[PDB]
Design a protein around this ligand. Structure first.
Ligand SMILES: Nc1nc2c(ncn2[C@@H]2O[C@H](COP(=O)(O)OP(=O)(O)O)[C@@H](O)[C@H]2O)c(=O)[nH]1
Ligand SMILES: [Mg+2]
Lengths: 158, 68, 65, 234, 199, 172
RNA sequence: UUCAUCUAGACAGCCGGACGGUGGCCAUGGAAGUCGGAAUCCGCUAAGGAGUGUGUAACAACUCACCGGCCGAAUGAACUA
């Protein structure tokens, strides 16, 4: 047999998120109901957070996994309450994430990065945090990056 | 603005005053249809029996005299 | 025809076979044509052409700045 | 008057001046003192992800690219201008897109890695054809028959002028789908490829050629000698 | 100027002539059915909201001219979060006294479950008052209503419970079936109009 | 006001001081400025309490205090602030931190008011008034949409009582 | 006339590269640099915009901003008469 890989972006926890997979599923002949059920089952950890889903199709199967992404991990570490599309809109991500949680996200995202140092991976995660608009250690993430460059902040793992 | 209302750079995507529900929407549309039909009958009493029918035969009223 | 029928026709049948080349050659000739218009137009049309050229140059310099 | 008018673009990136070349010069001349082995690598038509993977694999070492003339000037053009003894041979052996690998690891390990490193790559012009490609008759699909048409998506209609004019392929638009009257042979296996055929293969997404780094020679700091490696120079 | 250019290309719809409205979820076969029964050039593509505006076709049944209207898809959302593209279909259904055909896909290749389609039908139920209603099950070449699950059959029976709708099966590759459903819709519309005019 | 003379000068901010407010128990003066900052002051000494409150990206528009009758005894009232960026931030001054950042508005928030039933009302330039709950992690309970333009101001029936706190007209 | 670039490579041309976090956040039926609103960062580089345009329903694909290879000697811009 051969392994087919599909990648998508979906809101975690929402069943029936395989509607946009119809051109992909069609020639493959799978069941969109079961595909969406498996996607929600694999994305049960993230509730109301957009995450990357990898679908493996081999023979007649459908396996769902969550690819870790910088934005999704930062939003998860932000620990926002779950939101509904009927009630909440235009929500800003301006919570607080500690530097230890940022370093944990950098450890999770280190494997698929070309940064030779965990300091470099952490600086990338802090750039993503600056993009999403949150605060790290009650300061600007770019200020944290400047502190790392100047030597005030030392990344533990070397 | 007009640019946001309509055109290549429009940003309006939902009605400004959305209907409360489909029942109110259908009641409003039925009332509007009834008013439109009554108005059409009221103008068909006079204007359609007058000006509209004359152009079918090509008849035109004579020029108004300047003595008036 | 209804709605965006010309765009649908372009999507379903394409354009004329020499459309891209002809448009590229016309846009290439545009500089010569502008110079010839500036040197050939007389009277009110020439004055208006010079005025519009000045306004376009001012707008371009402001955009660059 | 009567001169060409330069196109003006409003972008974010400026051109690099002499300061970038001087920085590369200083970095090369400092790496010469820092490290022990200096390897010459030929990396023509390398992809940036492949180069970054090579840089990641060679952690603890340095890989420096840039202008060949600048690198040769940093290494010393002649015997009276060389930065270190017997560096003119290493400078003169450079060619094309040349990378300098400053390292301290074992020569056998470096040779083993560069002999066993291989990646799939697009088939470049002036190279032997890796396969025989024939676009099948009928509706043209994105892969062009490499995968089954039931799985494949039809070729987008916006590419039809490109295939008709740049690729010189007789194509027509039927109901928004690109169609050909007869099967079109693109390349025959065991034939030198040109720019048009390489572009056709790249457009259809066939990556059958193999990219291997070429290793010219290396210089040893303490030995003050240069030895030819002759790896992937076939 | 922009409004003039757009409004010059709007299709001509007579709100007082014989009309067959086609409605339902996206990717169910509305445009395909319009292509089957008319000569309109509406696009048929396997993604949602290929059709962003009303499309009109015409045909002749019993020496009479009928117009068929293809509408953009409708989602199961309240009117407050409903958008303009759906509002076109909603206004067409509310205004055009006609024969409405609600299309359902049982294979769920449209991306919407049978429960969601039944819910959407029951949500747009107040729209078609004093209009002919028919429920057309499309893509019967993939899966038939006969070999459906028991709970889904109960949902279909719940749809059929609403008076005075009729459930008919069709496939857009079945010329005979699309002609039969078109003729049945025309018969219902003609019966309603003649009964209204007779009073 | 007894001698009509200046008593203290507060010179912490860098830009225009857009709004000033007094704590309902009369203990701390809050100043929200044009530089997206809020500063707390002891009035008896004319001094600044710690560092400024930061987190807003645009200038502060209005300030409101938690009602004393809702504040538990032994605790200090919290401070809600609205700003041009469209967010309402809640600050606990005991730890000098920020608890909640309501962000439902799509335009500049004109005013924020903290009612006596544990609710907050925000009027903004997006023609909407948002009703939030302090007891539900700062969630938007309701959205009121009836205006065709920017809502400039809002007021409550018990606003005078909420502002006055436990004091009366006799100054007891 | 005054500024600049230049055999550790002048202007044009051709070819190659144009990366990774990442499909950055909000919003949308859909919006992945390129319908919109605000940020516009970090890493690896020789260089590569959270993107100059074409293009897609969204992707894809092309392009140029920039860098490199071939070519080898002058060239560009703004003013004045
Ligand atoms: N097998 C099958 N496929 C259909 C049928 N009707 C429509 N389709 C498919 O459904 C896809 C989209 O349908 P479409 O006509 O656009 O439905 P609409 O979105 O409601 O207008 C197309 O790719 C068709 O191939 C049918 O009767 N049988
Ligand atoms: Mg359609």
């Amino acid at each position: 047999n051969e392994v087919k890989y599909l990648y998508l972006r979906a809101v975690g926890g929402e069943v029936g998120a395989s509607a946009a997979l119809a051109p992909k599923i069609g020639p493959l002949g799978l069941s969109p109901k079961k595909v969406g059920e498996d996607i929600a089952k694999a994305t049960k950890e993230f509730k109301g957070i957009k995450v990357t889903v990898q679908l493996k199709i081999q023979n007649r199967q459908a396996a769902a996994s969550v690819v870790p992404s910088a934005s999704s991990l930062v939003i998860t570490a932000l620990k926002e309450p779950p939101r509904d599309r009927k009630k909440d809109k235009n929500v800003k991500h301006s919570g607080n994430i500690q530097l230890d949680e940022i370093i944990e996200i950098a450890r999770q995202m280190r494997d698929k990065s070309f940064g030779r140092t965990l300091a470099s991976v952490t600086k990338e995660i802090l750039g993503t945090a600056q993009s999403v608009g949150c605060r790290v250690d009650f300061k600007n993430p770019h200020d944290i990056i400047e502190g790392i460059n100047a030597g005030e902040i030392e990344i533990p793992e070397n | 603005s007009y640019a946001d209302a309509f055109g290549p750079k429009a940003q309006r995507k939902r009605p400004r005053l959305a209907a409360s529900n489909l029942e109110d929407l259908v009641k409003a549309t039925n009332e509007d249809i009834t008013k439109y039909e009554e108005k059409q009958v009221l103008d068909a009493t006079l204007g359609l029996m007058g000006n509209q029918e004359d152009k079918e035969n090509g008849w035109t009223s004579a020029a108004k005299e300047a003595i008036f | 025809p209804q709605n965006d029928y010309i765009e649908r026709h372009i999507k379903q049948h394409g354009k004329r076979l020499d459309h891209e080349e002809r448009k590229r050659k016309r846009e290439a000739r545009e500089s010569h044509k502008i110079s010839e218009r500036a040197q050939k137009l007389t009277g009110w049309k020439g004055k208006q052409f010079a005025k519009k050229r000045y306004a376009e140059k001012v707008s371009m310099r402001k955009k660059i700045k | 008057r009567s001169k060409r008018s330069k196109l003006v673009t409003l972008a974010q990136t400026d051109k690099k001046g002499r300061e970038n070349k001087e920085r590369i010069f200083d970095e090369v001349r400092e790496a010469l003192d820092t490290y022990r082995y200096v390897w010459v690598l030929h990396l023509d038509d390398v992809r940036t992800p492949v180069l970054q993977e090579i840089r990641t694999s060679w952690a603890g070492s340095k890989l420096i690219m840039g202008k060949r003339k600048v690198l040769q000037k940093a290494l010393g053009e002649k015997r009276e201008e060389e930065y270190k003894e017997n560096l003119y041979q290493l400078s003169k052996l450079c060619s094309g897109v040349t990378g300098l690998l400053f390292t301290d690891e074992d020569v056998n390990t470096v040779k083993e890695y560069f002999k066993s490193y291989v990646r799939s790559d697009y088939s470049r012009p002036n190279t032997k054809a890796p396969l025989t490609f024939t676009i099948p008759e009928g509706i043209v699909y994105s892969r062009g028959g490499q995968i089954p048409a039931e799985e494949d998506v039809p070729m987008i209609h916006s590419l039809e002028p490109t295939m008709r004019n740049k690729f010189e392929i007789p194509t027509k638009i039927k109901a928004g789908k690109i169609t050909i009257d007869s099967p079109y042979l693109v390349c025959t296996e065991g034939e030198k490829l040109d720019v048009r055929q390489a572009l056709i293969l790249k457009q259809f997404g066939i990556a059958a050629s193999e990219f291997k780094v070429k290793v010219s020679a290396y210089y040893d700091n303490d030995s003050s000698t240069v030895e030819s490696t002759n790896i992937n120079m076939e | 100027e922009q409004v003039r250019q757009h409004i010059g290309r709007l299709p001509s719809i007579d709100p007082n002539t014989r009309t067959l409205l086609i409605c339902g979820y996206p990717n169910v076969g509305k445009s395909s059915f319009l292509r089957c029964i008319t000569k309109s050039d509406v696009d048929v593509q396997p993604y949602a909201f290929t059709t962003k505006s009303l499309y009109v076709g015409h045909f002749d049944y019993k020496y009479l001219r009928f117009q068929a209207i293809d509408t953009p898809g409708i989602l199961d959302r309240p009117t407050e979060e409903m958008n303009n593209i759906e509002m076109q279909s909603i206004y067409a259904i509310a205004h055009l006294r006609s024969c409405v055909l609600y299309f359902m896909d049982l294979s769920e290749q449209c991306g919407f479950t049978i429960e969601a389609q039944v819910k959407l039908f029951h949500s747009i139920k107040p729209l078609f008052a004093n209009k002919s209603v028919m429920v057309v099950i499309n893509k019967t070449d993939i899966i038939r209503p006969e070999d459906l699950d028991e709970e889904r059959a109960q949902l279909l029976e719940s749809v059929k419970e609403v008076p005075g709708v009729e459930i008919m099966t069709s496939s857009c590759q079945l010329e005979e079936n699309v002609m039969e459903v078109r003729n049945k819709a025309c018969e219902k519309l003609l019966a309603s109009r003649i009964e209204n005019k007779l009073k | 006001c007894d001698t009509q003379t200046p008593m203290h000068t507060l010179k912490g901010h860098y830009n225009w001081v857009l709004c000033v407010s007094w704590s309902p128990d009369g203990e701390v003066i809050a100043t929200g400025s044009m530089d997206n900052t809020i500063r707390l002051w002891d009035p008896k000494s004319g001094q600044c309490l710690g560092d400024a409150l930061r987190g807003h990206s645009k200038w502060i528009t209005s300030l409101s205090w938690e009602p004393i009758h809702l504040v538990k005894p032994g605790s200090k009232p919290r401070l809600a602030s609205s700003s041009k960026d469209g967010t309402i931030k809640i600050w606990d001054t005991v730890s000098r931190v920020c608890q909640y950042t309501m962000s439902g508005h799509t335009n500049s928030v004109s005013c924020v008011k903290w009612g006596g039933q544990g609710l907050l009302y925000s009027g903004s330039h997006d023609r909407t008034v948002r009703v939030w709950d302090i007891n539900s992690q700062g969630r938007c309970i309701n959205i009121l949409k009836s205006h065709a333009h920017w809502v400039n101001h809002l007021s409550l029936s018990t606003d005078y009582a909420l502002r006055i706190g436990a004091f009366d007209h006799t100054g007891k």
